[PDB]
């Protein structure tokens, strides 16, 4: 994949979802595709006119097209309904890993990152439509726990 230009300031709010895409370029290309799709759709709504922004989006579009071509025979790519299901099960698995660590009193970077990225993946799922009830709740909870546990650790508090 051809690298993207520097992220425009206008697109600060998709920075982290684009990192989730890169984290999955080998691990789960379906996840990587949909993280990019969310970023592209969101960016287009933010600013598709400012030259720096339009340049960035154009290149992101190139990445999406290359990935879709590479993964074309994959049902999760040809049917967004199936892609959504894939993202849902994947994000839930990650959320529950973090949840189970928390409820066992095991506080560490891996479970903080799992809560954080699970929340980003639920953001990504909005590209498909309305979040499920569980998605709304789990995302709210994951954003809370990622930051709360990080804060407890850095300051010597017991969660």
């Amino acid at each position: 994949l051809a690298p993207l230009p520097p992220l425009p300031a206008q697109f600060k709010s998709i920075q982290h979802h684009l990192r989730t895409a890169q984290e999955h370029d080998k691990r789960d290309p379906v996840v990587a595709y949909y993280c990019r799709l969310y970023a592209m759709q969101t960016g287009m709504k933010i600013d598709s006119k400012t030259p720096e922004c339009r340049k960035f989006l154009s290149k992101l579009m190139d990445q999406l097209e290359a990935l879709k071509k590479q993964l074309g025979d994959n049902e999760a790519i040809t049917q967004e309904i199936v892609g959504c299901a894939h993202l849902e099960n994947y994000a839930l698995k990650m959320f529950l890993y973090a949840d189970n660590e928390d409820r066992a009193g095991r506080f560490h970077k891996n479970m903080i990152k799992s809560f954080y990225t699970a929340s980003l993946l639920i953001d990504v799922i909005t590209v498909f439509g309305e979040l499920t009830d569980e998605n709304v709740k789990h995302r709210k909870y994951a954003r809370w726990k990622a930051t709360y546990i990080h804060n407890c650790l850095k300051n010597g508090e017991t969660p």
């Binding site: 579009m61 879709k68 049917q79």
Partner: peptide, 15 residues
């Protein structure tokens, strides 16, 4: 129409 919006729409077109 916009080529970017069009490419995105075409990318997401369910066939």
């Amino acid at each position: 129409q916009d080529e970017l919006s069009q490419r995105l729409a075409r990318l997401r077109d369910q066939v």
